[PDB]
Coordinates of C-alpha atoms and ligand atoms in Angstrom, one line a residue:
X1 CA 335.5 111.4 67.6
X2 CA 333.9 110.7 71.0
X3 CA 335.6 111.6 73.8
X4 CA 336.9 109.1 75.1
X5 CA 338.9 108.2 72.1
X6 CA 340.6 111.4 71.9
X7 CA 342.2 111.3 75.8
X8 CA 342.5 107.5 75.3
X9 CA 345.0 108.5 71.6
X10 CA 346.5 111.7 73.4
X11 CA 347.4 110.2 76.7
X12 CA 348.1 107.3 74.9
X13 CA 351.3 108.5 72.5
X14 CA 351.8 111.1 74.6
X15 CA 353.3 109.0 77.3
X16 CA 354.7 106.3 74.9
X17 CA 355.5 107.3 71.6
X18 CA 356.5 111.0 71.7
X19 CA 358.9 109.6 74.7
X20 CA 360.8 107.3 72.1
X21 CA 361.5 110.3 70.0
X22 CA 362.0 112.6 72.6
X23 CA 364.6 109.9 73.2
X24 CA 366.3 110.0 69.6
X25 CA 366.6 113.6 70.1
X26 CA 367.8 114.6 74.0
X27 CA 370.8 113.3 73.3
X28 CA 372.2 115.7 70.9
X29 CA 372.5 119.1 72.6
X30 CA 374.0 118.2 75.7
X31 CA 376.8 116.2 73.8
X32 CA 379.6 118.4 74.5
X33 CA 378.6 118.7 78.3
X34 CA 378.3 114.9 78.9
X35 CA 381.8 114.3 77.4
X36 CA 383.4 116.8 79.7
X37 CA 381.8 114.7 82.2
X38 CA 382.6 111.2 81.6
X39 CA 386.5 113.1 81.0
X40 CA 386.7 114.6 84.6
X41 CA 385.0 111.4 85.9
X42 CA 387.3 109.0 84.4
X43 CA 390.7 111.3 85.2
X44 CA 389.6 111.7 89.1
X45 CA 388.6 107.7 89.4
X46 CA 391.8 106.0 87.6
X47 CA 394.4 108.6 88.3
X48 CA 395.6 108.8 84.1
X49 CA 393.5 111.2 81.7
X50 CA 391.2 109.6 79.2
X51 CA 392.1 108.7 75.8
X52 CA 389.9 110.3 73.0
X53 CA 389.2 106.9 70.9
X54 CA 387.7 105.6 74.6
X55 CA 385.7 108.5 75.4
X56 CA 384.3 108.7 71.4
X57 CA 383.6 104.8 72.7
X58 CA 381.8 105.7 76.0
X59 CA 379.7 108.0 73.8
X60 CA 379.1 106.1 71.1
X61 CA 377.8 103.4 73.4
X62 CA 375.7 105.6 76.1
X63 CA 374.3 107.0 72.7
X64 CA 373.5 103.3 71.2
X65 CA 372.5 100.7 74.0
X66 CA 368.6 102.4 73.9
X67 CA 368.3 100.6 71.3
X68 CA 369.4 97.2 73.3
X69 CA 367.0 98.6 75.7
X70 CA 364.6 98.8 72.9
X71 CA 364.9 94.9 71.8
X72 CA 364.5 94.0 75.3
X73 CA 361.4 95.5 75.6
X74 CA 360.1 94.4 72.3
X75 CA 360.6 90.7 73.8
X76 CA 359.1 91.4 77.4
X77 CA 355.7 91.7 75.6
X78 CA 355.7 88.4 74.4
X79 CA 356.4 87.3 78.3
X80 CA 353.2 89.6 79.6
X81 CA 350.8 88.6 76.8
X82 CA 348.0 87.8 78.3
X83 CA 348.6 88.6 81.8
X84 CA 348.2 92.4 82.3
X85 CA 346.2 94.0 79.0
X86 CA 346.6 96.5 76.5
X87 CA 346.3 99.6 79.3
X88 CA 347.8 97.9 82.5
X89 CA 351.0 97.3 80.1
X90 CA 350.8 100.9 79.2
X91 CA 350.2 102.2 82.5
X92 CA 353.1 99.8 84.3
X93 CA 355.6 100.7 81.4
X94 CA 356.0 104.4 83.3
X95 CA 357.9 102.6 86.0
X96 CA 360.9 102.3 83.3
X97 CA 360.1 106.1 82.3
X98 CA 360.5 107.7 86.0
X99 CA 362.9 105.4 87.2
X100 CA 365.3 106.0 84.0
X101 CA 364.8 109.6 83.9
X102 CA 366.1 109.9 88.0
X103 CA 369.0 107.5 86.9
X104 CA 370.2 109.9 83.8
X105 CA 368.8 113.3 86.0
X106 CA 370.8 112.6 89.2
X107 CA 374.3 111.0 87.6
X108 CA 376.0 114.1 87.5
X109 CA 375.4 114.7 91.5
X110 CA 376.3 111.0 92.3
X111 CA 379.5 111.4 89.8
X112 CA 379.3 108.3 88.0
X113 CA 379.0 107.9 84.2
X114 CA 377.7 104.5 84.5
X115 CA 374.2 105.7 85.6
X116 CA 373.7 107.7 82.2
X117 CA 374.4 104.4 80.4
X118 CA 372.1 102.0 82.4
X119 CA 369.8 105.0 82.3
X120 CA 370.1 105.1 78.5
X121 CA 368.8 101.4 78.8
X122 CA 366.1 101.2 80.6
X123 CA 364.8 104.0 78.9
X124 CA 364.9 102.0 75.7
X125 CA 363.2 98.9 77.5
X126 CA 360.1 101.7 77.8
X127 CA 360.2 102.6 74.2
X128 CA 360.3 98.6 73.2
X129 CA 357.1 98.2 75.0
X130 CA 355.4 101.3 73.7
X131 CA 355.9 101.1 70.7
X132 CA 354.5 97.4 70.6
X133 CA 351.3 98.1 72.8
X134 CA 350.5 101.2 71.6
X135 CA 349.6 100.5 68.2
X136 CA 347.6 97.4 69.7
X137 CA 345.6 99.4 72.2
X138 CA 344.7 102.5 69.4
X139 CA 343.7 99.8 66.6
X140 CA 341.7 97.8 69.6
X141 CA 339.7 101.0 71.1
X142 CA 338.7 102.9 67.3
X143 CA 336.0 102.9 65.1
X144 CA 336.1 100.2 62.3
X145 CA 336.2 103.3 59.4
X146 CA 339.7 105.6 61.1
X147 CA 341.9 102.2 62.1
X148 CA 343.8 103.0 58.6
X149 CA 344.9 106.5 60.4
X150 CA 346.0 106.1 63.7
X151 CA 349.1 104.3 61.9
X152 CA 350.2 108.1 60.8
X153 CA 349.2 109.2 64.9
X154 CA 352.0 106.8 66.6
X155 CA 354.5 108.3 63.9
X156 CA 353.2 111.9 63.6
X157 CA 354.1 111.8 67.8
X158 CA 357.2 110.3 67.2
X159 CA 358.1 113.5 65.0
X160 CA 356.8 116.0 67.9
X161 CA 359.2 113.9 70.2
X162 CA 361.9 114.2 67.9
X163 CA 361.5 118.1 67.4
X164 CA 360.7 118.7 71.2
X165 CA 363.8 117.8 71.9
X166 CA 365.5 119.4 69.7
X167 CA 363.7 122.4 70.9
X168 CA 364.7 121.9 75.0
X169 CA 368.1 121.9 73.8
X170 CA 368.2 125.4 72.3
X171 CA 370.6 126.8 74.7
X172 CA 367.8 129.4 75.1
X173 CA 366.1 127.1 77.5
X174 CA 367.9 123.3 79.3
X175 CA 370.8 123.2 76.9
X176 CA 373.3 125.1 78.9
X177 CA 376.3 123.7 80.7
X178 CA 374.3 124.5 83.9
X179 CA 371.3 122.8 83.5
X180 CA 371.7 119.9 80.6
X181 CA 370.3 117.2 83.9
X182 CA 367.0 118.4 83.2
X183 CA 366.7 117.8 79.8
X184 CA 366.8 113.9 81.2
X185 CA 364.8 115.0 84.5
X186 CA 361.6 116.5 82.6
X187 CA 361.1 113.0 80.7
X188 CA 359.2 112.9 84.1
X189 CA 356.4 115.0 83.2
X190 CA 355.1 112.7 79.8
X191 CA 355.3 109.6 82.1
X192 CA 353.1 111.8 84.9
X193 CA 350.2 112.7 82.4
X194 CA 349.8 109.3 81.4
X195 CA 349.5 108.0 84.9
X196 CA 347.1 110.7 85.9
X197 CA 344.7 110.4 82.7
X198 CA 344.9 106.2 81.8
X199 CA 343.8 105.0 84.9
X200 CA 340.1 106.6 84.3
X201 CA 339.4 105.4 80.7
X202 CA 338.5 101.7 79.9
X203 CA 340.5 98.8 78.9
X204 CA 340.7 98.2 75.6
X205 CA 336.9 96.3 74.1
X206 CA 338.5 92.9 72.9
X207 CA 340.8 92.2 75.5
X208 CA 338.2 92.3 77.9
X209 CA 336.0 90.0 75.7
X210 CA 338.2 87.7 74.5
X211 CA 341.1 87.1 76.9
X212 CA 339.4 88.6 80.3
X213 CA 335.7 86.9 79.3
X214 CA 333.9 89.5 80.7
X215 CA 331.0 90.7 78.0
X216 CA 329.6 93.0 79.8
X217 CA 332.6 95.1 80.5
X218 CA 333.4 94.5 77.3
X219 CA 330.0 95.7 75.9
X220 CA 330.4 98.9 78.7
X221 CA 333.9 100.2 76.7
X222 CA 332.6 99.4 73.5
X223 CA 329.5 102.0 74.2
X224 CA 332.3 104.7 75.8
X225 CA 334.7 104.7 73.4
X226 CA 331.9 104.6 70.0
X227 CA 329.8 106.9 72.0
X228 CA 326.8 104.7 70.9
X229 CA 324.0 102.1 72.6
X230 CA 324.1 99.4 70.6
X231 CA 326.7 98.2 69.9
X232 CA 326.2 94.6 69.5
X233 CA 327.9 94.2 65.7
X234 CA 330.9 95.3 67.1
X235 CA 330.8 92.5 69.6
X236 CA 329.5 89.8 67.4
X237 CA 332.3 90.9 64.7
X238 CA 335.3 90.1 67.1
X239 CA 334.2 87.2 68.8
X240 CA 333.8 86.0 64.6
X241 CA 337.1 87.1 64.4
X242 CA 338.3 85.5 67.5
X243 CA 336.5 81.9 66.4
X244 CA 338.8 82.4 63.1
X245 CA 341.8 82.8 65.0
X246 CA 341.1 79.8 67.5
X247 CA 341.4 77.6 64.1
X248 CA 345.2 78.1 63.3
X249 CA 348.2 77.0 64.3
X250 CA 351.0 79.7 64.5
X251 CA 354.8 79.2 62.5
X252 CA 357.5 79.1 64.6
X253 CA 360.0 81.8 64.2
X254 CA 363.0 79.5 63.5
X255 CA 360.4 77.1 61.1
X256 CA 359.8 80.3 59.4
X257 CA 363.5 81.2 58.6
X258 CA 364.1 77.3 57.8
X259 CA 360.9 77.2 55.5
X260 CA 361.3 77.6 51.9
X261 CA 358.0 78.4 50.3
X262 CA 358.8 81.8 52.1
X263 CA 362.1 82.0 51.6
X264 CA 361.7 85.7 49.5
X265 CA 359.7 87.0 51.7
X266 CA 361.6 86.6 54.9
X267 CA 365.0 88.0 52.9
X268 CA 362.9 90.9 51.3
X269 CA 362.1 91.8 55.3
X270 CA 365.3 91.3 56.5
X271 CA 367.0 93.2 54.0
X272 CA 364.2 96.5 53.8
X273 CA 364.3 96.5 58.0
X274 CA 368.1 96.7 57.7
X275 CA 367.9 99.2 55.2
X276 CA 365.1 101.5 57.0
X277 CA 367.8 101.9 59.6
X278 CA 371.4 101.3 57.9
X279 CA 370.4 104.1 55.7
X280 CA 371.9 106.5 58.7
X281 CA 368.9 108.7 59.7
X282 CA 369.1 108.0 63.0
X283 CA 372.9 109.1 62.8
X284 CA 371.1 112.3 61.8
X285 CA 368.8 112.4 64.7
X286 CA 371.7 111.1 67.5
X287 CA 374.8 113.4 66.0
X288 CA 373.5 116.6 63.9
X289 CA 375.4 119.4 65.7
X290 CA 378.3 117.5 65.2
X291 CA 377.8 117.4 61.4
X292 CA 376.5 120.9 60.6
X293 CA 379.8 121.4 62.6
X294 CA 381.8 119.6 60.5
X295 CA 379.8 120.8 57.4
X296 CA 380.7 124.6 58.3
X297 CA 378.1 125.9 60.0
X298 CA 378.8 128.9 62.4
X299 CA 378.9 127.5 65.9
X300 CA 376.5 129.7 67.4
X301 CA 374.2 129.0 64.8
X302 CA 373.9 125.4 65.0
X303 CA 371.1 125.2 67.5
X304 CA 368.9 127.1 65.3
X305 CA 369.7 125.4 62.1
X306 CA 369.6 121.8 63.9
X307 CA 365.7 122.3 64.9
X308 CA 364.9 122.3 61.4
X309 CA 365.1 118.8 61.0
X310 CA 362.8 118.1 63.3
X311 CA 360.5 120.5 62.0
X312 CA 360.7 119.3 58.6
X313 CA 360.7 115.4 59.6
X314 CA 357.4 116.9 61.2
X315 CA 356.1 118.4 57.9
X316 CA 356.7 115.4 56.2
X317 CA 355.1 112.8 58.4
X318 CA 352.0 114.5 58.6
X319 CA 351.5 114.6 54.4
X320 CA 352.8 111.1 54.8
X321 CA 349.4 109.9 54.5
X322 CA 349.0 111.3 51.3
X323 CA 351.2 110.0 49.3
X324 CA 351.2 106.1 50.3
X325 CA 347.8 106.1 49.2
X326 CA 348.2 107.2 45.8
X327 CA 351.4 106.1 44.6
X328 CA 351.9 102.2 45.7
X329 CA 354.4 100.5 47.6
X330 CA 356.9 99.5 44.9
X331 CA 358.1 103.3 43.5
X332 CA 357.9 105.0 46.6
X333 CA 360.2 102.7 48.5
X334 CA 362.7 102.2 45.6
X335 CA 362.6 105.6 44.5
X336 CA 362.4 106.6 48.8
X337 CA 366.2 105.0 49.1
X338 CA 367.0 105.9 45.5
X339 CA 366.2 109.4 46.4
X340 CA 368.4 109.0 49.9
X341 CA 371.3 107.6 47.9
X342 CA 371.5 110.5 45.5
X343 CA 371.1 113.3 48.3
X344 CA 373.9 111.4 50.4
X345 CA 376.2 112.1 47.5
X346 CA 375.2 115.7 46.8
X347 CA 375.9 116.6 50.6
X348 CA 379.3 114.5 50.4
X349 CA 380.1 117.0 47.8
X350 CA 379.3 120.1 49.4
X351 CA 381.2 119.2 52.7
X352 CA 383.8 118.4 50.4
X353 CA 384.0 121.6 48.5
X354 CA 383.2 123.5 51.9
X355 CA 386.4 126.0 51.4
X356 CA 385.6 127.1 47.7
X357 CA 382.4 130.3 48.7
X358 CA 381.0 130.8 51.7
X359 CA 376.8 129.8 50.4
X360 CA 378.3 126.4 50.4
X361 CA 377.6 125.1 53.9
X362 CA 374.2 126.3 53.5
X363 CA 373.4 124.0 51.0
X364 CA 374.3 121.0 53.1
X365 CA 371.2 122.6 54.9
X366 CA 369.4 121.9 52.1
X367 CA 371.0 118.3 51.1
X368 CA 370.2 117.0 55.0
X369 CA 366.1 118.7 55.1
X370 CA 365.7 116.5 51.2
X371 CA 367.1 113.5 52.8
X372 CA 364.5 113.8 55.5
X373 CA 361.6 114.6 53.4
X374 CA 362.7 111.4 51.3
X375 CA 362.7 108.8 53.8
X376 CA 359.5 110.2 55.8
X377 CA 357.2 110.8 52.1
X378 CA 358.1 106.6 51.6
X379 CA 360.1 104.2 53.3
X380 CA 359.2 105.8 56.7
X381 CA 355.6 103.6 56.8
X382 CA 356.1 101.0 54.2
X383 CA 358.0 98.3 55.6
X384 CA 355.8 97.6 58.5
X385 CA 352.9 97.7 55.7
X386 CA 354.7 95.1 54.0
X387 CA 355.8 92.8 56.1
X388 CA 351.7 92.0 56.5
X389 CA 351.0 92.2 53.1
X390 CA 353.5 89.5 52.4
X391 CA 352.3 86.7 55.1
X392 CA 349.3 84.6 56.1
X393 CA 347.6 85.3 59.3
X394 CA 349.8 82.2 60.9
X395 CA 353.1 83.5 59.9
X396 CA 352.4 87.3 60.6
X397 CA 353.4 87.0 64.5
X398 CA 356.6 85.2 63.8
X399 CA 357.5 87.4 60.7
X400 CA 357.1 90.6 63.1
X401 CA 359.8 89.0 65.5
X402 CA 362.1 88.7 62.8
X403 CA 361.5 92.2 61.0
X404 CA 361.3 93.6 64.7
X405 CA 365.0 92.1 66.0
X406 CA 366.6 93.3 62.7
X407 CA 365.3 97.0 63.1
X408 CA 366.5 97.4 67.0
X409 CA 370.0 95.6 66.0
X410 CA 370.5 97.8 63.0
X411 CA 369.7 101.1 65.1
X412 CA 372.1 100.1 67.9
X413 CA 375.1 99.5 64.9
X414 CA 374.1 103.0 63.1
X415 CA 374.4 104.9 66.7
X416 CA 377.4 103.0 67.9
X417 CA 379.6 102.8 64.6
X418 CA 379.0 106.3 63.1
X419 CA 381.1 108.6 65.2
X420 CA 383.8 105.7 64.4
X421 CA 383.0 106.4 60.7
X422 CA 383.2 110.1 60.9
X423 CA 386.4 109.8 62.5
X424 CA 388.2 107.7 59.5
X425 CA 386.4 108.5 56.3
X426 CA 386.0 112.3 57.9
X427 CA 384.6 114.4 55.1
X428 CA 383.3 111.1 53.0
X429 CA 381.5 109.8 55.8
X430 CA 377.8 109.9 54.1
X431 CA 378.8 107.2 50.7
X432 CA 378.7 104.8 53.3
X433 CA 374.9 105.9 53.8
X434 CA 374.6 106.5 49.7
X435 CA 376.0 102.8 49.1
X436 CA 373.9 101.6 51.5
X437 CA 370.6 103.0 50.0
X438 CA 371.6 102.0 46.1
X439 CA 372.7 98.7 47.2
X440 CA 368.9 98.5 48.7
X441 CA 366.9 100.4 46.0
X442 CA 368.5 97.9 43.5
X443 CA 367.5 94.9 45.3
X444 CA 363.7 95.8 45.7
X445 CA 363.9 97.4 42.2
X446 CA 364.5 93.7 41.2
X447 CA 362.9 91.1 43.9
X448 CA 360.0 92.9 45.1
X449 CA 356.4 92.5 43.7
X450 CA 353.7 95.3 43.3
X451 CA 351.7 94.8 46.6
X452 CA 349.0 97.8 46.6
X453 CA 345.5 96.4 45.9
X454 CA 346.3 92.8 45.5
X455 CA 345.7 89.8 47.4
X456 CA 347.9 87.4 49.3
X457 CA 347.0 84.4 46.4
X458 CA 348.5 86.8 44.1
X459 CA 351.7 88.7 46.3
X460 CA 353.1 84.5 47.1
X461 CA 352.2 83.5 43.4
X462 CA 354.9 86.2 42.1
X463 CA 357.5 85.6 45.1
X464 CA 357.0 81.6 44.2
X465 CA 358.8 82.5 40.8
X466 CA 362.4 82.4 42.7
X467 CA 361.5 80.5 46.1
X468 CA 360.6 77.6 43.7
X469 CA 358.7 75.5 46.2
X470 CA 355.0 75.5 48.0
X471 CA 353.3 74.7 51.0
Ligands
LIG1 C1 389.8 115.9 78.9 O1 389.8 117.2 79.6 C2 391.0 117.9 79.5 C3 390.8 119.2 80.4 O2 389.7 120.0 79.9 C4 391.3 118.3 78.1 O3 392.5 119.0 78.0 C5 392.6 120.2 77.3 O4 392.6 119.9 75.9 C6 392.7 121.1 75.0 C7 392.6 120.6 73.6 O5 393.6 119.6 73.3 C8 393.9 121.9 75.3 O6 393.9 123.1 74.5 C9 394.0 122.3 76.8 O7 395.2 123.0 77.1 C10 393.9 121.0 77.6 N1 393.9 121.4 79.1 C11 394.6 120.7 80.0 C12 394.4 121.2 81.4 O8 395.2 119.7 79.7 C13 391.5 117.0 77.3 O9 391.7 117.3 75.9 C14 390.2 116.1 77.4 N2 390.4 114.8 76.8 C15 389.7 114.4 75.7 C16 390.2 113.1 75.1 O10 388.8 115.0 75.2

């Protein structure tokens, strides 16, 4: 590690990623004092008190449209391309940051709800760029031998988002009725120390060769961030890879839905992106005071309890690394959701049987931390590793705009739909979440192909069993 890289990865997530969980998060505490605000604004604006299926509504959908924000934002990129480069996009993308977090900080003193919901947006536009960039930018700037690990950095700072704001909300420190605007206000701060620290580090070593054709700058950031003189391989080995790339012609994303020499592949995507997010741990990250409420918990001792799932989803995510290199993708995603499914059914029965001693609440403690240490051991990495495994270098941009678009509309129908859920299934809420991670542990138990240390000539050769058809 030069130095450099290490500014260039901290700076980097730090403003980007750690904001999209910070994101998941914030909006959990303060949950009680935003709905008595929407209530006192709607009653002295329409002259009739609020309904409580419209204000569980207004919620659910303040809660949700970040991740509308965040399919926006996955799409702008493919507008700037070329135009601005990897840091310029990074650096720019802080004008969604600060102008969001003064939206959500300062609705309560202009007294209109609607800013905390366009606020919500915008905010999710930043987290649909960053979390498209980002990944670019680290795999651009590193060393040929570490590009494996910096896929575990951009979620590792996702998890210190998540339990960050968890922690703000500890009514210790901003989650009081007196004070909840700052918890929105301080997202200033991240967006400030990446403005202050980007600006003096070099563009990313390939953009600058490739799309900017300029070698020597290119040459100059190559010798910062390696910390090295001559660096001329590195150089020669992306202009290779560049005169590879100039060769091919790239699939459509509609001509890769209508293809069928794919046609596994593309349902296999669609169904393990809708189930990464369907499975309801978001609903975990967006609503848990509300369910270690409804589970029993003593209310002054939610807080408390609450900021160990961050701190376990934490845990997790950094041993992450350990265990998708040993076991292969095929058990650890089938038994990741199998695992999910049966530890949605335990905690369904322990709400259930809340009444009959009082060490039964704690033990839907228990059944929520194994849920989380499930999903983030396994299916939290491997369905971005697979949708590349499973396509050509041609398909691979369109098949990332299909697997990207179902994640962000799955996420948006898990945070709008589960307070609606909770509401008419009430204490059988979570089978939803069980039948959705069986129904998808059976599926990949019986379509997908064993992926780890195998070629694409092999990976298309099983899938061509059932598509039936070639190139
Ligand atoms: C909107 O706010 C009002 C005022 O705080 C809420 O009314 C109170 O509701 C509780 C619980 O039903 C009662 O014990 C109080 O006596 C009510 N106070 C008044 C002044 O009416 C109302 O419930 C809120 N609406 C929704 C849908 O949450």
């Amino acid at each position: 590690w030069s130095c450099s890289l290490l500014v260039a990865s901290l700076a980097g997530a730090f403003g980007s990623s750690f904001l999209y969980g910070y994101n998941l998060s914030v909006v959990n505490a303060p949950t009680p004092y935003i709905k008595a605000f929407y209530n006192e604004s709607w009653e002295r604006r329409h002259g009739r008190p609020i309904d409580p299926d419209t204000l569980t509504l207004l919620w659910s959908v303040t809660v949700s449209i970040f991740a509308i924000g965040g399919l926006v934002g996955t799409l702008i990129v493919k507008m700037i391309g070329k135009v601005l480069g990897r840091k310029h996009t990074l650096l720019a993308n802080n004008g969604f940051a600060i102008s969001a977090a003064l939206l959500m900080a300062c609705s309560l003193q202009a007294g209109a709800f609607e800013m905390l919901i366009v606020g919500r947006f915008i905010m999710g536009i930043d987290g649909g760029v960053a979390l498209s960039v980002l990944p670019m930018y680290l795999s651009e700037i590193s060393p040929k031998e570490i590009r494996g690990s910096l896929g575990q950095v951009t979620a590792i700072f996702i998890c210190i988002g998540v339990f960050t704001g968890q922690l703000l909300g500890l009514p210790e420190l901003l989650g009081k009725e007196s004070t909840w605007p700052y918890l929105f206000g301080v997202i200033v701060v991240p967006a400030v120390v990446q403005l202050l620290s980007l600006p003096f580090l070099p563009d990313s070593p390939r953009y600058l060769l490739l799309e900017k054709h300029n070698e020597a700058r290119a040459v100059k950031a190559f010798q910062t961030f390696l910390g090295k003189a001559d660096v001329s391989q590195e150089v020669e080995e992306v202009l290779a890879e560049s005169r590879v790339q100039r060769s091919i012609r790239l699939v459509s994303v509609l001509e890769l839905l209508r293809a069928p020499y794919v046609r596994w592949q593309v349902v296999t995507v669609i169904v393990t992106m809708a189930c990464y997010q369907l499975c309801g741990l978001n609903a975990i990250w967006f609503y848990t005071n509300s369910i270690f409420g409804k589970a029993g918990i003593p209310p002054a001792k939610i807080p408390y309890v609450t900021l160990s799932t961050g701190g376990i989803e934490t845990l997790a995510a950094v041993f992450s690394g350990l265990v998708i290199e040993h076991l292969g993708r095929r058990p650890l995603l089938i038994g990741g959701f199998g695992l999910m499914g049966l530890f949605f059914g335990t905690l369904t029965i322990t709400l259930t049987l809340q009444d009959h001693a009082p060490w039964v609440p704690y033990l839907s403690i228990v059944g929520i931390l194994a849920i989380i240490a499930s999903f983030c051991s396994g299916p939290g990495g491997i369905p971005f590793i697979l949708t590349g495994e499973f396509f050509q270098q041609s398909q691979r941009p369109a098949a990332f705009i299909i697997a990207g678009t179902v994640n962000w509309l799955s996420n948006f129908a898990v945070g709008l739909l589960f307070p609606f859920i909770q509401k008419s299934l009430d204490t059988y809420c979570f089978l939803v979440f069980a039948t959705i991670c069986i129904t998808g542990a059976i599926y990949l138990y019986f379509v997908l192909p064993e992926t780890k240390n195998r070629t694409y000539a092999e990976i298309s050769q099983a899938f061509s069993k059932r598509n039936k058809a070639y190139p």
